[PDB]
Design a binder for these strands. Structure first.
Lengths: 199, 260, 131, 101
RNA sequence: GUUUGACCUCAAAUCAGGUAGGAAAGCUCAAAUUUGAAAUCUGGUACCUUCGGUGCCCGAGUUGUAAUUUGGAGAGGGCAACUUUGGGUUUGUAAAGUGCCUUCGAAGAGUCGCUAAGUGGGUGGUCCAUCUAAAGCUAAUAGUCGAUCCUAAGAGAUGGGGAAGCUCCGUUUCAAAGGCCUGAUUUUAUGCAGGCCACCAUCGAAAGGGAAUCCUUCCGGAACCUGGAUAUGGAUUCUUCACACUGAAUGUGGAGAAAAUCCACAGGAAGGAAUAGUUUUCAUGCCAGGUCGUA
RNA sequence: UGAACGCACAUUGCGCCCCUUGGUAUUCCAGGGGGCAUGCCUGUUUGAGCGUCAUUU
C-alpha cells in the first residue's frame, strides 16, 4: 500500500535530517561540537553559573522603584552577572576579559559559533561546549542563548571558578584536543557494516 | 419540501448525548461534569429512546440540547480556560528555575465565582432554603473529616466554620423543632422561614476513608454548597438584625470550639 | 563583534565547512515548497548589511527559481517578484543568495510590513510606508 | 467582601418551567434506624446473612438495625462518606423522569 | 526518572486587529561591547486633556531591539575660569557646540574579475591623476405535473509544480484533507485519556433513476405520499423479546438496474417488573407541506 | 449584481452557526436580526514531532 501517510512531511524530513547527521562525514570544525562536557562537569558548571543569573525585568523594575520611592520622600558595589549575547561575548573574548565561556552545541545556523572554540583557544580564554542552547537561556532569562560567559565573580566564588576552569581544562580541553581535529560522522549501519567491514 | 430525512428533527434535536455535548462544548469530560454539578444540569429520559438516539438501541445518556446551549454562554467556562493557561504558564515559570516570577504569577490570579449560578438556580430565598437540606448534609459530613492528600485542612476548616455559624444562628433563634438520634448520626429538623430543614450530623469519631470514593466530585459539590451557605447565612443573619460574619471568641474557642 | 567572522567565512564558499553545509541545506530546501517562509535569516550578517532588523514587521522568505535562458530576464528579479506576489501586504526590501544547484538558485528575500506600528512609528524605516 | 451582600433581596421569582425537574428530597429516617429501637426491629441471623449476600444496589435497606442500651455505646457510622458520595453521584448522573404515581 | 520539564521546527481556530485584488538641500544604515544594569518595541486592559498619553499585564527581542558613529572621518578622556538649551509650564549632577592636548582609530563576496584582494580596488593620462562598488532615503393559482434531488460521458477547485505574466498541467497526488464512540472526573489530587474507520469538494439530464390525485393547479366530491410529537386498544400468556412478536458495533443481499433512495439478512452489544416493567415493522387518533414554470 | 466574499448558478437553486419573536408547543412550523471566501503580517489560545536536551539530597 502507501503507509507513508503515518508520518507527516515535517516529521519525515525532521528524522531524515537526523539520519543524515550521523551518516555524513562531517568536517572537523563542525565535528568538534559533538564533544561536550560530561554529566558531573556540566552539573557543577551550572551551579556556579546559576548564582550569577541576571535580574529579570520585574525584579529590576521593583529595585529601581524602591530607590525612586526613597528619593521622592527624602555608594554601591559593581554588580555581577553572566554575560551573554554573541557580539558582546565575542568582544569580551578578544579583549581577554572572559574567565569562562560556555558555547551551545545546537545553534541552527552552526556557522554562528564555529569560530568560537578557535577564537577562545587562540586568545587564551577557557571555553567549554555545553549541551543545550535552551539551558543557557534559563540562566539568562531568555528562551535560548547561543553563548554565556563569566567576566567578574564575587570574591566568595573566586576559588570555585578557578577550580571549575581547571576541571574543564583536564576533562574537556586536554582530553579531546587530539580527536577534535578529526573528521567525524563515519558511523556505519548494520546493513552496511555487515557487507563492508565483514567482506 | 423534497422528502425530509429521518432521525434528524423531533425528539432527536432536543436530546443530545454526552459525547456530542462534550465535543460541542470543546471541553474535557471532567470540566463538563463540574459545569453540570454547578449549574444543576441532569440527564433526561426521552419517551422514544430509539428515536433520540438515531435508530440505535445502544445505551447512552441524553441531555436536553437547550440546556447545553445555555451552558455554552456560561462565564465559568472562560475562567476554566484561563486557569488552564495560568497553570501552563506557572509550570513554565518553575521549570525555568525562576521562583520570583512564579510567586508573582500566583499573586496575579483570580478564580471564578458562583454568585450568578446560585442566583439563577434559586431565583428566590425559599428555593435556597429548599436545597439547604442537602447542602447542610454535605457540609456537616466534611466538617467531621480528617485532612488528607486530596482534601486539605483549610477546606475542612471552612466547612466547620460554616457549620458552627449555622448552628449558632439556629440556637440563637430557637428554631429546632424535631430531633432523632440514629445509628448513622443525629437528625435535626428546624423551621427556617416557614420551611422544614432536616440535616444529619455524624458522631464525632475518627473516620475510615475508603479509597473507593472519588473526592474529586465531592470537592466540587462542597465548593458549590459552601458559597450557597455563605449567601444564605448572610441573608439570615441580616434579616434578624445580627452582625455577620459573627465574631469568633478566641478565648472560648480554645476549650471546646463549638457553636458557643 | 561576531559579524566580521561570519562575513569573512561566507567569502569561502567551497571550503569544507561551507561546502558540507550547502550540500546538506540544498537537499533540505528541495523538500520544502518552492516559496516558503524562513523562520530566521540563514545569513544574519548579510541581512543586517542589507537592512534587516530583528523586530516585529520584518519577514524572510526562501524562494528557488529554475536556471537557464532556454524554455522547452534575471533570476533574482523573478524570485523577488514571485515572493512579493505571495505576500502582497508587504514591500520587498532586499534579497540575497543562499544556495544553488545545477537546476535551481535559492534566494532569501527580506520584506517589511508597512501596517505594523513598529515600522510606522520609527522615522528610520517609515519611508517604505509611503505609497 | 466575598459573598457579603444580599443575593435574592426581596425578589419572589419562580423557576416553574416545564423541564425543571427538582430532586424529590430524601425519605425521612424511620424507627428501625434509631440507636435504641424497639426489640422487634432487629434482624435475625438468617435475615442478616440474606442482607449481607445481597448486592449493594439490590438491598432494600442500606444498613442493619442495631439496638444500644446507652448513648455512649453507639459507634461511629462506617458507611457515612459513601452515602454522601452516592447521593451526590445520583444528583447529577441519575436521569430524572416526571411520573404520575 | 518507564517520570517531569525546558527549547526547536511545523500546524489549527468563523481566534484579536489589519492588509492585497478591480477601475537648488542634503543625508541615513552595516562594519570597532550599554555591559555599572534591552537603556528598545507591538498588543490587551483601565482612565485621560484621544491623529495621541499614562499606569498595569501578556509577549517580541541577546542568532541583537535603543543611545553613539558614516573619511567631510569618527571615538574615549583632559583643559577653557568658553558657548548653548525643551514642551503645551521646564530640571535631569540631562542633551549638545567651539578651540587645544592626549590615547585610539571598523569600512557591504557567487561580488569584482571558473571565481578574488586589503598601504586593496575602480576608471583614465601620455610613473601620474581621480574616485571608493557589490546597502538605503531625498523637494524644486400545484404537497401529488416539471425544475428542485442523484449520478452518467466529461468538465473542474483544493495539495503540488511550470511560466515575466495574462495563466497553464494535474484529479488523489510523499497533503497534518474528519467524523464517531467509550469513560464514577483523568491517583503526588480536579490542565483529557483510550478506541474505530478509511478517502476526497463541486458542476454536469425540464427525453436517464425518481414518494404521492382522480372524476391533473381554481370549485365540489373523493384519495394518496413524506416528516414529526404523541394518546388509546391489543400483543409481549406467570410475571421478562409469541406460535404484533427488542436487536449495537461489524459484514452481506434485493429493488433502483452510475449514483441518490428504500428494504432485508448474519451478528449477539445492551435493556426490561409489584399503586401503570421493556418494544409498539399491529390498529386507531393529531399537525404540516416553502421557491421557480404554468396564457 | 458586479474585484464580489457560505456553496453553486444558463437554476434568481442548496446549506451551516448564533440571538430573538409568533402559532396547541421542551420536540413541530414560520418570521426577524447577525454571521460563515482566499493569500499574507503581528499577536492570543489550543496542539504535533523517540528533532535537541536536562532529569538520584
Amino acid at each position: 500500500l502507501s503507509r507513508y501517510v503515518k508520518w507527516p512531511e515535517y516529521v519525515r524530513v525532521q528524522r531524515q535530517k537526523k539520519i543524515l547527521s550521523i551518516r555524513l562525514k562531517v568536517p572537523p570544525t563542525i565535528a568538534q561540537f559533538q564533544y561536550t562536557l560530561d554529566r558531573n562537569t556540566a552539573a557543577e558548571t551550572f551551579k556556579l553559573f546559576n548564582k550569577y543569573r541576571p535580574e529579570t525585568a520585574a525584579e529590576k523594575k521593583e529595585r529601581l522603584t524602591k530607590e525612586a520611592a526613597a528619593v521622592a520622600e527624602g555608594a554601591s558595589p559593581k554588580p555581577y552577572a553572566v554575560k551573554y549575547g554573541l557580539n558582546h561575548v565575542v568582544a569580551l573574548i578578544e579583549n581577554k576579559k572572559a574567565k569562562l565561556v560556555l558555547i551551545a552545541n545546537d545553534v541552527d545556523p552552526i556557522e554562528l559559533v564555529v569560530f568560537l572554540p578557535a577564537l577562545c583557544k587562540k586568545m587564551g580564554v577557557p571555553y567549554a561546549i555545553v549541551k543545550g542552547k535552551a539551558r543557557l537561556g534559563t540562566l539568562v532569562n531568555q528562551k535560548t542563548s547561543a553563548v554565556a560567559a563569566l567576566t567578574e565573580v564575587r570574591a566568595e566564588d573566586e576559588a570555585a571558578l578557578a577550580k571549575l576552569v581547571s576541571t574543564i581544562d583536564a576533562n574537556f580541553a586536554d582530553k579531546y584536543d587530539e580527536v577534535k581535529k578529526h573528521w567525524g560522522g563515519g558511523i556505519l549501519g548494520n546493513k552496511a557494516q555487515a557487507k563492508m567491514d565483514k567482506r | 419540501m423534497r422528502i425530509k430525512k429521518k432521525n434528524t428533527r423531533g425528539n432527536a434535536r432536543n436530546f443530545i448525548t454526552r459525547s456530542q455535548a462534550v465535543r460541542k462544548l470543546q471541553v474535557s469530560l471532567a470540566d463538563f461534569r463540574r459545569l453540570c454539578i454547578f449549574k444543576g444540569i441532569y440527564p433526561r429520559e426521552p419517551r422514544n429512546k430509539k428515536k433520540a438516539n438515531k435508530g440505535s438501541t445502544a445505551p447512552t445518556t441524553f441531555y436536553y440540547a437547550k440546556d447545553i446551549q445555555y451552558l455554552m454562554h456560561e462565564p465559568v467556562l472562560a475562567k476554566f480556560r484561563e486557569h488552564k493557561t495560568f497553570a501552563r504558564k506557572l509550570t513554565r515559570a518553575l521549570g525555568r528555575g525562576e521562583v520570583s516570577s512564579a510567586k508573582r504569577l500566583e499573586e496575579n490570579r483570580d478564580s471564578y465565582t458562583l454568585d450568578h449560578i446560585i442566583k439563577e438556580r434559586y431565583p428566590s430565598f425559599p428555593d435556597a432554603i429548599r436545597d439547604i437540606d442537602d447542602a447542610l448534609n454535605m457540609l456537616f459530613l466534611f466538617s467531621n473529616l480528617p485532612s488528607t492528600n486530596q482534601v486539605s485542612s483549610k477546606i475542612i476548616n471552612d466547612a466547620q466554620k460554616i457549620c458552627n455559624q449555622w448552628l449558632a444562628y439556629v440556637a440563637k433563634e430557637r428554631l429546632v423543632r424535631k430531633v432523632f438520634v440514629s445509628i448513622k448520626g443525629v437528625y435535626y429538623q428546624a423551621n427556617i422561614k416557614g420551611e422544614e430543614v432536616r440535616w444529619l450530623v455524624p458522631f464525632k469519631f475518627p473516620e475510615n476513608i475508603p479509597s473507593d470514593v472519588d473526592f474529586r466530585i465531592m470537592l466540587t459539590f462542597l465548593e458549590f454548597y459552601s458559597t450557597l451557605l455563605h449567601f444564605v447565612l448572610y441573608k439570615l443573619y441580616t434579616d434578624s438584625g445580627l452582625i455577620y460574619p459573627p465574631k469568633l471568641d478566641l478565648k472560648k474557642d480554645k476549650i471546646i470550639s463549638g457553636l458557643s | 563583534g561576531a559579524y566580521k567572522y561570519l562575513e569573512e567565512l561566507q567569502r569561502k564558499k567551497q571550503s569544507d565547512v561551507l561546502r558540507f553545509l550547502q550540500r546538506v541545506r540544498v537537499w533540505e530546501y528541495r523538500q520544502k515548497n518552492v516559496i516558503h517562509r524562513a523562520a530566521r535569516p540563514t545569513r544574519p550578517d548579510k541581512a543586517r548589511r542589507l537592512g534587516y532588523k530583528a523586530k516585529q514587521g520584518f519577514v524572510i522568505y526562501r524562494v528557488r527559481v529554475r536556471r537557464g535562458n532556454r524554455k522547452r530576464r534575471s533570476l533574482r528579479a523573478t524570485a523577488e517578484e514571485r515572493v512579493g506576489r505571495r505576500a502582497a501586504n508587504l514591500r520587498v526590501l532586499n534579497s540575497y543568495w543562499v544556495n544553488q544547484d545545477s537546476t535551481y538558485k535559492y534566494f532569501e528575500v527580506i520584506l517589511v510590513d508597512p501596517q505594523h506600528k513598529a515600522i510606522r512609528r520609527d522615522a528610520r524605516y517609515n519611508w517604505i510606508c509611503d505609497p | 467582601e466575598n459573598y457579603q451582600y444580599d443575593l435574592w433581596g426581596d425578589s419572589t421569582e419562580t423557576n416553574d418551567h416545564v423541564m425543571h425537574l427538582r430532586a424529590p428530597k430524601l425519605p425521612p429516617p424511620t424507627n428501625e434506624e434509631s440507636y435504641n429501637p424497639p426489640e422487634e426491629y432487629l434482624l435475625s441471623p438468617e435475615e442478616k446473612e440474606a442482607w449481607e449476600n445481597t448486592e449493594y444496589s439490590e438491598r432494600e435497606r442500606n444498613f442493619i438495625p442495631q439496638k444500644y442500651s446507652a448513648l455512649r455505646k453507639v459507634p461511629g457510622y462506617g458507611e457515612s462518606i459513601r452515602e454522601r458520595f452516592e447521593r451526590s453521584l445520583d444528583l447529577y448522573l441519575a436521569p430524572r423522569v416526571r411520573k404520575n404515581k
